[PDB]
Amino acid sequence: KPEAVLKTKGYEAAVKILDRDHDRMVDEIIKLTEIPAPPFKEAARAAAYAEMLKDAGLQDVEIDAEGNAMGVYRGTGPAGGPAVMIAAHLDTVFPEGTPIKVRRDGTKLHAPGIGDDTRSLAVLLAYARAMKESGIKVKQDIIFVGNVGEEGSGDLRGVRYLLTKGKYKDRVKSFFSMDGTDASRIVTGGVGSKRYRITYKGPGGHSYGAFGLVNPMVAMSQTVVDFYKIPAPAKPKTTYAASVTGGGTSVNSIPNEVYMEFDMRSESPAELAKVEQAFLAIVQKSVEGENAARSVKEGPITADVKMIGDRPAGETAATQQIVRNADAVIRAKGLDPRPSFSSTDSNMAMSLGIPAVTIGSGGIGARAHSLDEWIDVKKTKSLEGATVGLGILLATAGTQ
């Protein structure tokens, strides 16, 4: 049984070290938070995190070609065998120039990205330190990762490299992402994203003299009209939107270039592919329809299909052992397990058939993805919450 790892002497010893060095964990949250990591600019924080991973006594600490920082907690099994990966992303949503200095408010700490996801970075370091000092022996290797590109336009570039090209691509059989502070969350589902900018081009000309020629504005408008007739099931939740538009010079001219940006989301990879294929077909039919309705004698309407966002959809079945481990540990810790869909790093592992769950770092936090982000490092709740992820991790890797 998974929750039995909570009654092992190794875990209880490791929790005492988390208790003893909780003051160190908070210092490392502040140190890493004040190293800003905007999207595609995580190199500075990755270097600092890499130093802290080897400071925790991990093996083979390195930074891969993508920018992820890794460390190995070697298990008792054969080298190169099945392993557990647990990651917390280095990047934040805040762009370069955002002033990040931690502000203390009694037991609260205010700083952009302090809970998403910098706290999880330090909680993983505390896991590695406490496990090694207490002499915990795991059956499978554990790869502690500070990955890049989880937020915004990063589009999971970090976990994609780890799981399709990196050293551990063939060894990760259980993937964890520690994202957020809610230690009762169990993200078992991944909401996918497909986003395009369609640029419609045409010959142009005078609105009066060249009237009758094809107008790319109409083909774009016709796209939106058919777009919002695509069936979207309530469950699995499937959504879409026409969100950004632009183009044209003046009312004196027929436009020669206009653009519309589209959003498509779904909990189901099958439903997301249905919408994407219908959207791409609607784009083609809308261009053909405009070239039939008006004159192409000066050149036809053309459409440039550019993908501007891609995140896979997926799910870990509730019967998978990794979910049963997370459910059992969270129950035994007195919390209510919250299985949910979301858009996290685990989306990548789910799309590859790898059992994956996204978990929380513990304690209290709020106002993520905003400048008012803050966490509560009150020891009783911050420590007890941080002990949850360790139990899930040790139950999954297996202890001896």
Given the rule CB under 8 A, which residues bind its own copies?
191, 195, 207-208, 211, 215, 217-218, 220-225, 228, 232, 237, 239-255, 258, 260-263, 265, 293-294, 308-309
- Amino acid identity for residue 188 in this structure: T
Q: How far is the CB of 134 from Zn ion (least distance, A)?
A: 13
Q: How far is the CB of 69 from Zn ion (least distance, A)?
A: 13
Q: Which is nearer to Zn ion, 179 or 290 (CB)?
A: 179
Which does residue 276 bind out of its own copies, Zn ion, none, counting CB within 5 to 8 angstroms by kind?
none
Q: How far is the CB of 210 from its own copies (least distance, A)?
A: 9
- CA distances to 10, 68, 145, 305 from 80, rounded to whole Å, are 25, 20, 17, 42
The answer to whether the annotation marks 298 as part of a ligand binding site is yes
b vs e for 56-76, b when ≥16 Cβ sit within 10 Å of the residue's Cβ?
Answer: bebeebebbebbbbbbbbebe
Q: How far is the CB of 260 from its own copies (least distance, A)?
A: 8
Site mask for Zn ion (CB under 5 A), range 216-245, x = bound: -------------------xxx------x-
Q: Would strands 108-110 and 103-105 be described as parallel, antiparallel, or unpaired?
A: antiparallel
Long-range contact set of residues 156-160: C-beta below 8 Å, sequence gap at least 24: 156/311, 156/345, 156/347, 156/348, 157/66, 158/66, 158/67, 158/68, 158/87, 158/89, 158/345, 159/87, 159/345, 159/348, 159/349, 160/348
Using CB under 5 A, which of the segments 51-59, 163-171, 272-280, 348-356 binds Zn ion? 51-59
Burial zone of 103 (CB within 10 Å; 0-12 exposed, 13-18 middle, 19+ buried) = exposed
Q: Return the closest-CA partner of residue 262 out of 253, 270, 252, 272.
A: 272
Q: How far is the CB of 307 from Zn ion (least distance, A)?
A: 8
Going by the annotation, the residues of the binding site are 12, 20, 23, 27, 55, 66, 89, 96, 116, 150-151, 155, 179, 206, 261, 267, 298, 315, 327, 369
Going by the annotation, the residues of the binding site for Zn(2+) are 12, 20, 23, 27, 55, 66, 89, 96, 116, 150-151, 155, 179, 206, 261, 267, 298, 315, 327, 369
